[PDB]
Design a binder for these strands. Structure first.
Ligand SMILES: Nc1ncnc2c1ncn2[C@@H]1O[C@H](COS(=O)(=O)NC(=O)[C@@H](N)CCC(=O)O)[C@@H](O)[C@H]1O
Length: 529
RNA sequence: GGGGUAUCGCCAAGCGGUAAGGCACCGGAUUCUGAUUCCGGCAUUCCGAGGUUCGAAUCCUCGUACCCCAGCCA
């Protein structure tokens, strides 16, 4: 429960409403991030919890910043998260004609006029946060001139920035938004939905209140930066002929430590090629997390946990991670994989090999079991063998022994180093019938694998607050390793996650895995204390 | 100037009866994953200072900190 849901309960009870109708209205000017997920869960979640409706509307009022690839990727993300919208997908562009007609109604009521102040003068005439603005010398044109001048704008008779439509309100309002807000501006750009039919586009504030109203929206839910906008929102609907007046509510926007959360900054990371793309596994985008291995249910869980309030906040990576660990720990089948391999021979072993059974899930037999190949030449992680080490070290130590996961107990005996003195192969002996603990892979049956370990994109908690956030990127946000996995992973499918015992949760695709050389992304490491 | 928010490290309930929960953390028990699971601990105070009240984090007052607004962006 959150304040907004309680308001809804109140509205329902009092009969003010009989159905709830929300909307998710992103601008297709980039991909969606975990923040947008919070909005998606909120808006669609309320819809299904109350048997209401949630529309998917592309707020496409600015052609030069938008692209068809973005709308495509957005429908994709919303669908992947697990939500369905009301009827067809909607586009603000579907209302250009309506918007144009409503602009004409305002002009007719003397509430709007064509201003010819340059883009620099409008700022000069706007006043400041502490000084009132001043009326434009064109503010009192007659209905007829405005009507004529507006038509010229629509017809392309004005070069960009030479004219625009403004609402006639109050140049001396403490709300800078009421200082004669621009309704329409000229843009000779092609629109991904309307082609070149328009050379004038409606602004956000004008478009949104009308789109919500025509769509029958009952609760327009957005973020805190739009609180000031509410006054203009109500002003517009109050002055045009439209039957419904949706109520607005603002919640705080999500912030995650060690990353940025604005399409503008994320896009910069894409354009300057510092990440592979919007869906790079290190990105806080929804598609990036998906490729990283997060489940749509783990994201819905996270959104549910962080809550919806009016307080500024920055969640910790640990929280998001706990969500993904909870899911995978329960559903991900276990497998063996060695990231930093070192040859280990069991001089004691006779033959070409045998087969040992391993649980597909240690704490869940119902998830079945599988046959895994064991032999005399195996790979173990270079970090699980110490010639000495303290008393805490519970792994392989020269002279001492360790249990091979779901297999035999081996005793390190003789080690062998190379030129620079690095160990090349560890010699051990195994007990006839013996079935800490370390994982392993039979060298002979091992599947060569590329393992991509990921880490926080940035070095600091709040990279957004840095002068040059790019200069604070973590050089080790991605580190690639070549290792060995049990033959079993030969069937691994993209997106599907596995737990590589004693390491973490991994998944395929990564956009790079082939048939010859598979690529696994570390979604997240195991809780290691 | 206007609009907002201040409750345990990070989130977050609480709407006058006198501090939920999650994440994190600290112990202990399990365990062929130093994982998981499982017990136990963790704000005598709710930005601060007065005030109304039998009693407030929840009502009032004066403060203080932080966030958003001066795109023909959204
Ligand atoms: N970090 C964050 N945390 C949580 N919610 C966030 C968010 N960033 C954006 N949002 C919300 O996502 C929705 C779409 O984002 S967006 O594509 O930028 N488009 C817009 O903001 C505007 N076209 C919508 C205006 C409105 O809804 O009043 C918008 O509704 C916006 O409020």
């Amino acid at each position: 429960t959150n304040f907004i849901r309680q308001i809804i309960d109140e509205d329902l009870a009092s009969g003010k409403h009989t159905t709830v109708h929300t909307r998710f209205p992103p601008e297709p000017n980039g991909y969606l991030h975990i923040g947008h997920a919070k909005s998606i869960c909120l808006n669609f979640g309320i819809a299904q919890d109350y048997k209401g409706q949630c529309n998917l509307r592309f707020d496409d009022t600015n052609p030069v910043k938008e692209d068809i690839e973005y709308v495509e990727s957005i429908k994709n993300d919303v669908e992947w998260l697990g939500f369905h919208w009301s009827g067809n997908v909607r586009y603000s562009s579907d209302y250009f004609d309506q918007l144009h007609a409503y602009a004409i109604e305002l002009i007719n009521k003397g509430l709007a006029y064509v201003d010819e102040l340059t883009p620099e003068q409008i700022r000069e005439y706007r006043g400041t946060l502490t000084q009132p603005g001043k009326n434009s010398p064109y503010r009192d044109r007659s209905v007829e001139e405005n009507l004529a001048l507006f038509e010229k704008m629509r017809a392309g008779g004005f070069e960009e920035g030479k004219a625009c439509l403004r609402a006639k309100i109050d140049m001396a309002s403490p709300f800078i938004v009421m200082r004669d807000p621009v309704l329409y501006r000229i843009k000779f750009a092609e629109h991904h939905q309307t082609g070149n039919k328009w050379c004038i586009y409606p602004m956000y504030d004008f478009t949104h209140c009308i789109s919500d109203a025509l769509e029958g929206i009952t609760h327009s839910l957005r973020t805190l930066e739009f609180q000031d906008n509410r006054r203009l929102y109500d002003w517009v609907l109050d002055n045009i002929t439209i039957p419904v007046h949706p109520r607005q509510y603002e919640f705080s926007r999500l912030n995650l430590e060690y990353t940025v959360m604005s399409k503008r900054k994320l896009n910069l990371l894409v354009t300057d090629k510092h990440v592979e793309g919007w869906d790079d596994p290190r990105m806080p985008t929804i598609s990036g997390l998906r490729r990283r291995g997060y489940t749509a249910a783990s994201i819905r869980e996270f959104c549910k946990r962080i809550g919806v309030t009016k307080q500024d906040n920055t969640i910790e990576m640990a929280s998001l991670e706990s969500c993904i660990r909870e899911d995978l720990n329960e559903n991900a089948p276990r497998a063996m994989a060695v990231i930093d391999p070192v040859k280990l021979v069991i001089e004691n072993y006779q033959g070409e090999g045998e087969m040992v059974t391993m649980p597909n899930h240690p704490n869940k037999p119902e998830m079945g079991s599988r046959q895994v190949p064991f032999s005399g030449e195996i790979w173990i992680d270079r970090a699980d063998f110490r010639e000495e080490a303290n008393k805490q070290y519970k792994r392989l130590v020269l002279g001492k022994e360790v249990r091979l996961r779901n297999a035999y107990v081996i005793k390190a005996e003789r080690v062998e180093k190379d030129a620079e003195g690095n160990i090349t192969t560890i010699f051990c002996t195994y007990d006839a019938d013996t079935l800490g603990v370390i994982h392993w892979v039979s060298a002979a049956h091992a599947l060569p694998v590329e393992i991509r370990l990921y880490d926080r994109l940035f070095s600091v908690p709040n990279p957004g607050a840095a002068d040059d956030f790019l200069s604070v990127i973590n050089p080790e946000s991605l580190v690639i390793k070549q290792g060995f996995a049990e033959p079993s992973l030969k069937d691994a499918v993209a997106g599907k996650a596995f737990q590589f015992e004693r390491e973490g949760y991994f998944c395929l695709d990564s956009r790079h895995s082939t048939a010859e050389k598979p690529v696994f992304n570390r979604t997240v490491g195991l809780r290691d204390t």
